[PDB]
């Protein structure tokens, strides 16, 4: 699983000591976050399940 | 200008955030997601 974005965090003092962090900027260009899985492994995995069912 | 699934997903935004002083505010540009903001009805 990955969040493939090169990002930038900025900081702003909002109170006498209260300084929070926020999602400032993205370097590169915008990419979806996703997850991979071996399909044939998972069908073989799920084939074991239904036998137990 | 984006065709992918990420279109209309990240939103540039603007503030008037209170600074550390009592009578000083601040216009702040930031980024947010669809699943964090709600429309009210540059809306």
């Amino acid at each position, epitope marked *: 699983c990955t969040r*493939p974005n090169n990002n930038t965090v900025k900081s702003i003092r909002i109170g006498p000591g209260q300084a929070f962090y926020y999602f400032g900027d993205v370097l590169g*260009d915008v*990419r*979806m976050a*996703h997850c991979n899985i071996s399909k044939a492994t998972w069908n073989e995995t799920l084939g074991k399940v239904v036998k137990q069912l | *200008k984006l*065709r*992918s*699934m990420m279109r209309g997903e990240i939103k540039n935004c603007s503030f008037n955030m209170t600074t550390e002083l009592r009578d000083k505010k601040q216009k702040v540009y930031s980024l947010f997601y669809r699943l964090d903001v709600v429309q009210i009805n540059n809306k």
Partner: antibody
Amino acid sequence: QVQLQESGPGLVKPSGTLSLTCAVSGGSISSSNWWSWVRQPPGKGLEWIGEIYHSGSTNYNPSLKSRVTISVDKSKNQFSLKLSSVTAADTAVYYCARNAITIFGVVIIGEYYYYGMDVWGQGTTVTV
Amino acid sequence: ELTQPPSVSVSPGQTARITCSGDALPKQYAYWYQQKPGQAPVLVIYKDSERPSGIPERFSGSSSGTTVTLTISGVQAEDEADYYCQSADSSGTYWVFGGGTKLTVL
């Protein structure tokens, strides 16, 4: 290079279907781009018509969604520009077309840039 | 679907500014072409600001809301050709063309 040769009928009887074919020289239509058709009436500007992907996904002019259907002969690296009974209102020069794109990220979610339409056809003076 | 000024004439040494208008332009890119006479029309500007390789830097491009701008800085007399802007649907389904642009230098 990939060269676009155009093919189809010649002088056209009015209100007839016009199936046309782009002989893609250097034909390597794997899945890499979009392919499409545009046209130019002989004293006017251009007119976008339709668009196809290799898998069979097609796009069309909504102004010409009825009378226009397209396909592809990947067995011969050829295209299909088919029409319905189109009158003599469309006696236009016809262009074989290549929407080249640029794969940005994951191709399945459609994360790519339309590069500019790269390589043109030849010019098909269809007289109806 | 797209508005385009049909004819803009200049003198040499100027800077040409050609626009197109359209409602999908705040959501779609716009691509620029150059029909030289009797020629295959050449890609000029992609992604609203990018020229490809083999293109001189005289050609510039920018967007403004529902308006775009084709920019030719330091106009030469041999650049007299047609210029077509291309975008697509608001839904991003079908492509459309601009009307037309005729240059006349000198």
